[PDB]
């Protein structure tokens, strides 16, 4: 059908080392706020991890968008992947993210998925965690679970989040889970396991903020994905960061072409339901006419024509990880040749030291300049990951573009 706004958009989602219990949790919150509220479709585990591939290695993959409501407001839940393999897709994820929920097993504690991600959520730009300790159903000894508290606000605090003051909910994801299949209308206060994720719900109203959003600057939206829809055509889909669009509108798909290239609008919508005009912090799909989806890709942004130049050369401030990090265990030379992860973009670069900078250590501050082998929306002040070789090795801001 059609989207009616009622309430403010705010974008969520999960992250945290992998089968903690990320997706169990985003199945869960559909269910529970789906009883209290009729606009809410209920998303079973299955739903959210449908993808063969996932049924195959028995993980979460892609990033999955589920839709709900609260009475405040209405949100838009990335639940991404934990497994170290797929870290690309948690950044992507985690690009659209206005505030994350960082999900820890009781039982195992932080993990080195639960640091990664904590880490690169700062990366593309996450400014709020919200925890919930999960499987505590399987946890009685209450002194392991204050340590698994104590080490995961620990955490947060190492990567500049609050972490003495982030909620903490205690709680069992697939319990409530278990409670609203037997009781879909299991109301708020009948049960143990379905209060803990009103808990969780009502601290994501009340701790995360509704950003400031500007739709007056140009149009700029970062494409998360791009897929065919059968009769229809080319959807490519992300949150928009500013500005507006309305179909009809004339847009530019910019960066990883030689080429820009423009093309129409041809639809937007939120959730399936047809919007009249997709506006900043909304997450969408739009209909792009006259393009493939071996013509628009991940990575690229679609902007008001002539608004953005994308780039390739540029200065940077960059801080390399220890291993006690998960980093590099030795430093790199110019020509190191990592991968670079803008919001949703991820591109080879090549790092290019200074004459009279022969090495970089792990653990140092550094600046060095950069050369994407592809063009790539890029400003001042936009912070980056550096990974390679499947680990994370940099964390970065752009200090200045030269190209
Ligand atoms: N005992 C218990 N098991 C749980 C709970 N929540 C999830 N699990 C179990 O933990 C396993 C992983 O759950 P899942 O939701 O897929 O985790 P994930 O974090 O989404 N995995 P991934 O990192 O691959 O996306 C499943 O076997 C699930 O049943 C819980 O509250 N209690
Ligand atoms: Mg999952
Ligand atoms: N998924």
């Given at each position: 059908?059609?989207?009616?706004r009622?309430?403010?958009h705010?974008?969520?989602?999960?992250?945290?080392?992998?089968?903690?219990?990320?997706?169990?949790?985003?199945?869960?919150?559909?269910?529970?706020?789906?009883?209290?509220?009729?606009?809410?479709?209920?998303?079973?585990?299955?739903?959210?991890?449908?993808?063969?591939?996932?049924?195959?290695?028995?993980?979460?993959?892609?990033?999955?968008?589920?839709?709900?409501?609260?009475?405040?407001?209405?949100?838009?839940?990335?639940?991404?992947?934990?497994?170290?393999?797929?870290?690309?897709?948690?950044?992507?994820?985690?690009?659209?993210?206005?505030?994350?929920?960082?999900?820890?097993?009781?039982?195992?504690?932080?993990?080195?998925?639960?640091?990664?991600?904590?880490?690169?959520?700062?990366?593309?730009?996450?400014?709020?965690?919200?925890?919930?300790?999960?499987?505590?159903?399987?946890?009685?000894?209450?002194?392991?679970?204050?340590?698994?508290?104590?080490?995961?606000?620990?955490?947060?605090?190492?990567?500049?989040?609050?972490?003495?003051?982030?909620?903490?909910?205690?709680?069992?994801?697939?319990?409530?889970?278990?409670?609203?299949?037997?009781?879909?209308?299991?109301?708020?206060?009948?049960?143990?396991?379905?209060?803990?994720?009103?808990?969780?719900?009502?601290?994501?109203?009340?701790?995360?903020?509704?950003?400031?959003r500007?739709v007056?600057?140009?149009?700029?939206?970062?494409?998360?994905?791009?897929?065919?829809?059968?009769?229809?055509?080319?959807?490519?889909?992300?949150?928009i960061?500013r500005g507006k669009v309305?179909?009809?509108?004339?847009?530019?798909?910019?960066?990883?072409?030689?080429?820009?290239?423009?093309?129409?609008?041809?639809?937007?919508?939120?959730?399936?339901?047809?919007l009249?005009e997709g506006i900043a912090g909304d997450?969408?799909?739009?209909?792009?006419?006259?393009?493939?989806?071996?013509?628009?890709?991940?990575?690229?942004?679609?902007?008001?024509?002539?608004?953005?130049?994308?780039?390739?050369?540029?200065?940077?401030?960059?801080?390399?990880?220890?291993?006690?990090?998960?980093?590099?265990?030795?430093?790199?030379?110019?020509?190191?040749?990592?991968?670079?992860?803008?919001?949703?973009?991820?591109?080879?670069?090549?790092?290019?030291?200074?004459?009279?900078?022969?090495?970089?250590?792990?653990?140092?501050?550094?600046?060095?300049?950069?050369?994407?082998?592809?063009?790539?929306?890029?400003?001042?002040?936009?912070?980056?990951?550096?990974?390679?070789?499947?680990?994370?090795?940099?964390?970065?801001?752009?200090?200045?573009?030269?190209?």
């Amino acid at each position: 059908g059609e989207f009616v706004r009622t309430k403010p958009h705010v974008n969520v989602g999960t992250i945290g080392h992998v089968d903690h219990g990320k997706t169990t949790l985003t199945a869960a919150l559909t269910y529970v706020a789906a009883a209290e509220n009729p606009n809410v479709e209920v998303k079973d585990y299955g739903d959210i991890d449908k993808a063969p591939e996932e049924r195959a290695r028995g993980i979460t993959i892609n990033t999955a968008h589920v839709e709900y409501e609260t009475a405040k407001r209405h949100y838009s839940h990335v639940d991404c992947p934990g497994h170290a393999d797929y870290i690309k897709n948690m950044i992507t994820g985690a690009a659209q993210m206005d505030g994350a929920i960082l999900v820890v097993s009781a039982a195992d504690g932080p993990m080195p998925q639960t640091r990664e991600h904590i880490l690169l959520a700062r990366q593309v730009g996450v400014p709020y965690i919200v925890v919930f300790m999960n499987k505590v159903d399987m946890v009685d000894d209450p002194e392991l679970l204050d340590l698994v508290e104590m080490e995961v606000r620990d955490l947060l605090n190492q990567y500049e989040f609050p972490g003495d003051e982030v909620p903490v909910i205690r709680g069992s994801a697939l319990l409530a889970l278990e409670q609203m299949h037997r009781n879909p209308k299991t109301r708020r206060g009948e049960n143990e396991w379905v209060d803990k994720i009103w808990e969780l719900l009502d601290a994501i109203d009340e701790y995360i903020p509704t950003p400031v959003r500007d739709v007056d600057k140009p149009f700029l939206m970062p494409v998360e994905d791009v897929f065919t829809i059968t009769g229809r055509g080319t959807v490519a889909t992300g949150r928009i960061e500013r500005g507006k669009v309305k179909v009809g509108d004339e847009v530019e798909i910019v960066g990883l072409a030689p080429e820009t290239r423009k093309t129409v609008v041809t639809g937007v919508e939120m959730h399936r339901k047809t919007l009249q005009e997709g506006i900043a912090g909304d997450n969408v799909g739009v209909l792009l006419r006259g393009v493939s989806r071996e013509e628009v890709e991940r990575g690229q942004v679609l902007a008001k024509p002539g608004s953005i130049t994308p780039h390739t050369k540029f200065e940077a401030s960059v801080y390399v990880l220890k291993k006690e990090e998960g980093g590099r265990h030795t430093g790199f030379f110019s020509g190191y040749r990592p991968q670079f992860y803008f919001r949703t973009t991820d591109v080879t670069g090549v790092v290019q030291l200074p004459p009279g900078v022969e090495m970089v250590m792990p653990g140092d501050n550094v600046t060095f300049t950069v050369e994407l082998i592809k063009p790539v929306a890029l400003e001042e002040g936009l912070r980056f990951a550096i990974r390679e070789g499947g680990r994370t090795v940099g964390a970065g801001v752009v200090t200045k573009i030269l190209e």
